[PDB]
Design a protein around this ligand. Sequence first.
Ligand SMILES: *[C@](O)(C(=O)NCc1ccccc1)[C@H](C[C@@H]1CCNC1=O)NC(=O)[C@H](CC1CC1)n1cccc(NC(=O)OC(C)(C)C)c1=O
Ligand SMILES: *[C@](O)(C(=O)NCc1ccccc1)[C@H](C[C@@H]1CCNC1=O)NC(=O)[C@H](CC1CC1)n1cccc(NC(=O)OC(C)(C)C)c1=O
Lengths: 306, 306
Amino acid sequence: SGFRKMAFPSGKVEGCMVQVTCGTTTLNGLWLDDVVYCPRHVICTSEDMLNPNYEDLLIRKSNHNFLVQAGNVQLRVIGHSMQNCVLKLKVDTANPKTPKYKFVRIQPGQTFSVLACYNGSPSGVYQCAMRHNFTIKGSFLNGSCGSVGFNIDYDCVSFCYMHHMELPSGVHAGTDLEGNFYGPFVDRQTAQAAGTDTTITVNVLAWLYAAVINGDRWFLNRFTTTLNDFNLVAMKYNYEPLTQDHVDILGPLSAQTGIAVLDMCASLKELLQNGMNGRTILGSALLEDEFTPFDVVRQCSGVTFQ
Amino acid sequence: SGFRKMAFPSGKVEGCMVQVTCGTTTLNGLWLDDVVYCPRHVICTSEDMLNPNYEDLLIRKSNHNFLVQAGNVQLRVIGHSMQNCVLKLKVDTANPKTPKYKFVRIQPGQTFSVLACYNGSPSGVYQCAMRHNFTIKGSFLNGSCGSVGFNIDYDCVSFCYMHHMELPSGVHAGTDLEGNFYGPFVDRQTAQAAGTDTTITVNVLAWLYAAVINGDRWFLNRFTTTLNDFNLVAMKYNYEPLTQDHVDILGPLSAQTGIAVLDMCASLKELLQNGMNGRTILGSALLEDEFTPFDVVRQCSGVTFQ
Ligand SMILES: *[C@](O)(C(=O)NCc1ccccc1)[C@H](C[C@@H]1CCNC1=O)NC(=O)[C@H](CC1CC1)n1cccc(NC(=O)OC(C)(C)C)c1=O
Ligand SMILES: *[C@](O)(C(=O)NCc1ccccc1)[C@H](C[C@@H]1CCNC1=O)NC(=O)[C@H](CC1CC1)n1cccc(NC(=O)OC(C)(C)C)c1=O
């Protein structure tokens, strides 16, 4: 009973957070086995930030220019290397708290938990979606760079995001753990714009299934729709096209509720055309799009992790 | 920048969660030093739930009846005791991961993080407010009882909630860690209902201040109101009366923004009377009341825990 935006338990990732300082800049790093991963702009001064030549700047650095602290312990840096927009600092000690992990690049519409960290110390946890303009709607202040986003499957932590920068109107951009940016962005202090954002249709449909599962049924109508006719309306309201893959992905939820996917699309189509008429769904007065189909199943069926 | 509903990092609590089985009932317990805390109804059959005589039921229980697992390590129960609605199981092994902790009874209007667990394994984290009707808007399934709510101050975990039950409005009720229910609820299978609930006015104001700090400022206006006139309008909408102590508690956010509380109240009065005209505030189309002034200050100033 109840439906909440829910993050993964963050303990397995808390144990990996360290502090990385280079010269005047302190941010967070991720300590896995004997490697610390952090944003490469830790080597920049405020002047460098406006147009940095990272390869040239890094040649000027040595292992001892990197001060890495895990709580009250300094880790010795014995090697360093750049991979795209992240640095990899080899350290002489392996992290005893390293969880089972992998690095993944997620797709737009997929969600993950962010452990917001400052000076190597975890501060809070919240859920984010990779939007189709490759931004996230985060909560990030000075010092949060190097905080990571992740999912947990059983005991395995999949790291998918490392935080680098803020974009206009309070949204955020970063890389995967191989240092490749999500979206057309670059780690440079210059004006950069994100593309127009859109609503994540398959996620709205998942959340409408969550609503039915939790006893909110008032938006269900007696119609069905074809995929084409639905998308004609969806595009008029800045919704992402719904694909047959999306329909197929919603299958398990539609079996759980006895409401065919294209029937739910006909109810969504009516909501888009007529609005919500001042009524709420799952305690929201708008249509929510940052719950994936899996998020809904996971929460409504009690999947756990250890 | 950016403002998100944010839970505390949960790892300090994850290291305390265990599974407690008694007969056919399995739920979660909280393992601190050599004591495991869990809901006393773990000793009940469904037949016991109608009017359980907990004192008599417990007398018939052996230490051997209590099967406690921490991961795949069984803990030997060597003693048990009842305190109000919580059972205290003394175990052979003190929890090596016991954090610095306190037991506190939170006040209505205040927030805390819930670590939802099943079979002693953490599954997710989210923020809840203790409502004025002594319920919380949680997400809890079969097997979640014994999950706890907490705040973290520096390195001290203040445990304030243990989950016991769901109500016929989709909300939840439980105890403090001394086993005393919040609200008038009882741990037996009887018809129970949440009282009327009021909107937490001081929290709505704090969230409007959060909005301004993050640059979402369209609802600000040049008008001011008296405290009494604001409360005349507020009371009609089932908002909690705003006291002078509330105005004082908002002092830090008022000073940060330069917007006097009675100036902000004129925004809130206009939003109550005329609605939002299809705009959002921090991404919400309704007025959010589950952020405390401290939650806003904590998030917008970036304080950290360890
Ligand atoms: C990250 O570097 C960080 O946390 N660094 C440690 C630190 C920084 C400053 C002071 C003390 C310690 C920050 C994270 C930012 C901060 C505010 N919100 C965030 O998400 N990243 C940057 O500052 C980033 C670095 C560039 C990519 C390499 N940066 C620099 C300068 C400007 C912006 N953004 C910005 O100005 O956006 C607009 C829309 C123009 C306001 C930026 O992200
Ligand atoms: C908690 O006891 C628990 O999780 N126990 C272990 C377990 C239970 C069931 C199956 C396997 C394992 C549950 C938590 C509830 C369950 C679903 N969501 C929750 O939040 N608590 C209860 O069942 C509670 C126990 C009473 C306090 C001692 N209980 C009993 C009887 C009735 C209700 N409520 C209820 O019927 O609510 C409605 C909305 C009317 C369905 C109740 O919580």
